[PDB]
Design a protein around this ligand. Structure first.
Ligand SMILES: *Cc1c(COP(=O)(O)O)cnc(C)c1O
Ligand SMILES: *Cc1c(COP(=O)(O)O)cnc(C)c1O
Ligand SMILES: *Cc1c(COP(=O)(O)O)cnc(C)c1O
Ligand SMILES: *Cc1c(COP(=O)(O)O)cnc(C)c1O
Ligand SMILES: [K+]
Ligand SMILES: [K+]
Ligand SMILES: [K+]
Ligand SMILES: [K+]
Lengths: 455, 455, 455, 455
């Protein structure tokens, strides 16, 4: 049901076990914003699963063999051949992380006035697309926008919406389809192989490109393995390779499913696009032979991507997240459903139904969680959504959530219990959670440095 | 009652997740002796807690700062001042591990024909003592020999036995008292501060020296803090320092409670002893300034000893072992009680009541455990006890046990569940466990390479 | 005049010691382009000093203490306070390397149609400037363009050129002065404190901002200490701090003078600029708290920058490069003069007077060097200058050089002898060096993958 | 003539570049005993070549893959098969370093009253032999005792002396021949393959065992390669394998020619001796599967022994030592000749001919060297020889030397120049070097902690 860790602990990270009264003082000095907390003051840090992973002994051995050459590094060649073998693409261009690849992709594939259609969007990626003159069109299935609906493969593209876009704007006016795995804005929801294939088939008929934003493609492959009929005798590597056989290229954040602390890459099949990518990469990242990465990180990412294909590893990764969500759900705590590959999202609108969205229920719940347990979580609600600079009004997102984001191979089920038990205890007296108000609000990037006090 | 790990995972060790049928084949190739298994074939290796610990990030940082100089190394100065501060002895001599320190002590403190008395013995230490012409006398309380008996501080010395020795032999004929913390042969049982005090008082009145075999002294300090009334307001460090204030020196295995993979030391207060120690260490270990250790290992051990003093670390260490024993006990599995600081010992006599000791129930239980779970454990019974050289018969120890020895900071509670669940399942069909017989018996060190088959 | 290395070797990098005949075959497989050689096939790799530095034991210890948190990392706090202390700017924004910082600066400080004036340019930086709609104006002193001329502080700005710009265009039409230390295109030539002061005085009177492209600022500080009268009693740190006191901010490549393999940052004093910078960094690099770097790399760079301030380190760094140039000069080998902080540039025009620039003397000299010595160097001539897109003709740069670029702390004087002796032997038979012609020319970034054969 | 380093520097060790006046104060605080200096205060530490070597990137990768299992570690298996392949022995028993192997060997191979004959002796080894009741007989050729005689293979055994021993005491009374490579007491002098073979042939005829004390066997193999006719087409590995084909076993210090900071082993062919060794190793070192070493050190030593076979590495190692000796000799500085594989010995009796041996010319010269250059060297003269405890008189050795002992891969030719130039300058005013007298003399191990002041 829940497997034990399919690894041993090789080394540990020292933590301060500061008690409740001291955590409250830290939380106050941070202005009740978990983004302002010092890492040294946090027991369990679930701010993000990006770049926070534990590497293996084998990756650390790789880190000692960094070949730091500007061109022709053995580490580059190892990353290159690993990604060619596992993802099946012709050309690989390393980037320092995922958004560096997206910056390149947008410049390579978008003419101004064109549409980019995808299964929801990621803030930075959408910025790059719009900066290049594209209009983003969301073609995810309707169910994805219903955070309570417990159904499989909620990340799937609605083929009818894609069909309508093609009919209305013309294929030649579509830059590409951006297919994300898993889908962030729906809570880490997977995409079925059936959907990927149907998308390939429709787009190919019209000459439209498909590029994958593949940041959690291994979590995705695990869901296919577990839940899509016909995949029960297939290895994770076999599923991953098939997934990408339905794309023209991809952007990858090594920092997520490649089990590293930094790293990414851009893949493609097209020789002309590759030629062009080589010129752009130099401008923003570095030579095509390192792409803004140390040789030791190309090595660590080549090693980690291969480790990610081990069935027992990814099964455990996803079931650990699931354990946390199952324990919360069994106690009545409201969460986004189904639980995603990388995180559990608390529904803070429902958890704190006595608070208005203007009193920042997600921000306040995240503060309470830290004070009660030493666990840091991320506000993913009204604060992060930011203000409308035209009107001065909050953007008021339908999702008012606290994200419990789980780094790979860092925490145990007992840490998941610390998280769950603390949240369950807060839920039992949820009416006591106080609202927040700004005492300092930056004009930009307000989630990162805003400060609050209790109402 | 079971705390979460008070640390995060920094790096992981890759393990083979081989299935049962393949484990059976490995166990057979190892002639059903867990000592012959390949490390690469083992999921959870509970052969020993000695030298198998996960280091922290801070120790690994120290490992990069190895000052490898033959004399005057910063790492030696760091180790020296750390031991002086935390153990309180005037002089420190590094050794490659504990038995190197015991080798020196035996040569420095024993005249031919004297007695060494202690709370049970460690095999290699008794060897050194006798090689220097001492007779060993066991002065442990009788309860220590009763595996099933659940009493606190089972490792305590019987002061009446001590008194009897003094009266029968004379004080001038006792080289020293060797007080071990914790006590191996009783299953990792602790010694109280009251006993250490009373032993010191009686010996000092007679001019008899006391040396500690301090290999799990921090586990011991934890039992004092948790269970000895009057110690509830003391830090682990205050307890450790007080323990050593009742001794003239110690031998230490850093491989156990200093959280390293290699290292030990000898401490004393006496200047003349220290001078003679310097001459001896050179011949067996290395110069007094490194003692058969790399500079980086003196550094790791200096760091590790200070980390061991953190309450939450040692509370978790001991309660994790306790969890494994509690879960086994709740299912009716016979174990040595109370659970020790470092291991749970299955009582194979009671587990396999249908087998005679001559059929090697501990060896066979250890084999079945590996086959069912991927867990390696150590035979600590008739096989390890070896053969009588005069009579040709087995030494037949009273305790016939399988030792589930827990490395520090390597495993989680979910690993403990893997161990417990597999042993509980075996216990539910205990009658099916088959006796073993030798098919190859070496003349010396037989537990290491002997091979068996089922009767 | 040449000091010994002010450090010891902690660890070594394994290299191939392949003989001449095998090097010839590698060079041929690389189509006589050193950019295509495999790192594993190179004994001494002088392609670049960027990112190829040997770190110390103390940096590697810092690498073990990577605090990988998305915000609030101890490593970010260490980098931030180190830069504030040593460079003296209010605000620091990490970037994955220098061109990431330049990308942000160009977007923050340039309005369409303004001029950026500087002492020559770096290709990628000029690209960003022009992409933001600036026209670049070179205000370097004329001597900087005269490769053979041996004068001090060749990188200095011509203040009369600056004055002319201000009078012809108006101050409101100058976005900023970009002052580079040291100056790449003049061969690593330094800028005096007097010039930095005079530039600041003139610009400040007109309300024009100054930003430093500070990639080899510590090499530059060394030239000031050694050669600018009045600086003989100042530490390298005092010099660096004073240099930056004449600027409104900087872009930094830690990959050069901060002694690391990856990393950079952007600094500024202005609060509004810092706020806008935070929004931009997120889209291109990462959160302002890591900027596209692992925590361990922020830590290494923080450590490396402080190590760079040690006089003996930077004295040795620069005098080791000088030794290679002095030895070449003493044999009559034509080089750019004075020798720069980081590289010796062979003047391939003078080396191969029997070849026309259209026969690619620098490319061919670089090839022969590898074949004769196992040493890789970079073509910095007509090939790297690329092709005119309008006319289809080569850009024909005045300087046609081979760059012998020296990574910090990687090589010894005996390696420099290997380099010099092989080049002196080639020079003794310079007439034998054959012209090259393309057999494959890419349309973009041609120096990276172009292939040649002998005419 | 002198090759460049056949490696690059991967990482560096930070040094204090304290000037002359500060070094003098340090030297004073150390009581003019270089053994008392702090490592942090030394620029170039030539105290010993034992355990001070720089490891490769590949060895450091190995260090990250330590398999710390008590038995069946992959690292043990790698060391085992590497030594079997390269040295040709059947059985390998790791030990923490060389003297641990010697302790075992003496107990395994000596009956009381027997003779051990060798080519000179090593202090700790002779202690082990005598402790087991053997009498040591020196059978080195006469020339070895003439430190000025410039001849090849000065370490050779005199077959006539071995013949005489056999005739006089009987073969059955000879425990074994201990053949050392290279020979320490003669200044690091090699043994020819011809001599090894002649020794094997004579001993085999009489049934006498031969064991090699093989600590610098790779330096030895390089001398055979360079100077013994018939070995010019043989690889270093081929010579090493042949050397050991003439022994029954060996003791090895990894700390010298295996390029590690700790580690050693005992080898043998005999099954019964191996069985016995297994019992003893447990008592003094650890299980036969780790022998007092961390798994990562067995791995580092397995890797390093293989790296030591590279021709260019060992050629450079030996020629660097030679460069130092050649430079000294060319200036008239008196040294032991020929220069050995690992060190240059200054003849301090000749260097300081105005001082009596009672004024400690070697100790004083070593102090002067440190003050003038920051270089630490070892006294190998009257101080180290110690006192006769029966008579109270100094042992007065024929060799009164300062040992300039060179760690492998740590220093450059420029460091060798710092050493040489300083010594050459001291030589030019040698009459000014003052004698020393004790102000504090320990009863034991006096070289390690004695303190002096100037006469
Ligand atoms: C994380 C993510 C990115 C950005 O990658 P980074 O490595 O964080 O820059 C882009 N797209 C998706 C779908 C992501 O999940
Ligand atoms: C482990 C132990 C030893 C031996 O120490 P090592 O480090 O294994 O050599 C000696 N005495 C006791 C009581 C021990 O626990
Ligand atoms: C190296 C350099 C850059 C680019 O920095 P990277 O770290 O290579 O991106 C920009 N400007 C100057 C003056 C440089 O020297
Ligand atoms: C160094 C040496 C030893 C001792 O080895 P360690 O590893 O220092 O204990 C023994 N014999 C010879 C000939 C040596 O050179
Ligand atoms: K990170
Ligand atoms: K170990
Ligand atoms: K690099
Ligand atoms: K050492």
């Amino acid at each position: 049901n829940y497997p034990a860790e399919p690894f041993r602990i090789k080394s540990v990270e020292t933590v301060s076990m500061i008690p409740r009264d001291e955590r409250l003082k830290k939380m106050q000095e941070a202005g009740y914003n978990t983004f302002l907390l010092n890492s040294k003051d946090i027991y369990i840090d679930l701010l993000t699963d990006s770049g926070t992973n534990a590497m293996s002994d084998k990756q650390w051995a790789g880190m000692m063999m960094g070949d730091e050459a500007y061109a022709g590094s053995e580490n580059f060649y190892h990353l290159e051949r690993t990604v060619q073998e596992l993802f099946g693409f012709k050309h690989i261009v390393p980037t320092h992380q995922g958004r560096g690849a997206e910056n390149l992709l947008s410049q390579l594939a978008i003419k101004p006035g064109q549409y980019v259609a995808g299964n929801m969007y990621f803030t930075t990626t959408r910025y790059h697309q719009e900066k290049n003159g594209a209009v983003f069109v969301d073609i995810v299935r309707d169910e994805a926008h219903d955070a309570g609906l417990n159904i499989a493969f909620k990340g799937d593209i609605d083929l009818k919406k894609l069909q309508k876009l093609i009919d209305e704007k013309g294929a030649e006016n579509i830059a590409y389809i951006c297919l994300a795995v898993t889908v962030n804005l729906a809570g880490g929801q997977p995409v079925s192989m059936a959907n990927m294939r149907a998308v390939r088939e429709l787009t190919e008929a019209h000459g439209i490109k498909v590029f994958y934003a593949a940041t959690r493609c291994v979590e995705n492959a695990y869901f296919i393995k577990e839940q899509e009929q016909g995949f029960e005798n297939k290895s994770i590597a076999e599923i991953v390779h098939e997934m990408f056989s339905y794309a023209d290229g991809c952007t990858m954040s090594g920092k997520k499913d490649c089990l590293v602390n930094i790293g990414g890459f851009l893949c493609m099949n097209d020789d002309e696009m590759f030629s062009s990518a080589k010129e752009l990469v130099v401008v923003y990242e570095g030579m095509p032979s390192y792409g803004g990465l140390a040789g030791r990180d190309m090595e660590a990412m080549a090693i980690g991507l291969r480790e990610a294909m081990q069935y027992e590893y990814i099964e455990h990764r996803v079931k650990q997240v699931r354990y946390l969500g199952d324990k919360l759900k069994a106690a009545g705590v409201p969460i986004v459903e189904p639980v995603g590959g990388h995180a559990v999202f608390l529904d803070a609108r429902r958890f704190c139904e006595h608070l208005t969205q203007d009193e920042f229920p997600a921000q306040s719940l995240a503060a309470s969680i830290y004070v009660e347990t030493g666990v840091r979580s991320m506000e993913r609600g009204i604060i992060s959504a930011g203000r409308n600079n035209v009107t001065g009004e909050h953007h008021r997102p339908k999702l008012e959530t606290v994200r419990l984001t789980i780094p790979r191979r860092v925490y145990t089920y007992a840490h998941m219990d610390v998280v769950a038990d603390g949240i369950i205890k807060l839920y039992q007296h949820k009416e006591d959670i106080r609202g927040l108000k700004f005492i300092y609000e930056p004009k930009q990037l307000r989630f990162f440095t805003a400060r609050f006090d209790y109402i």
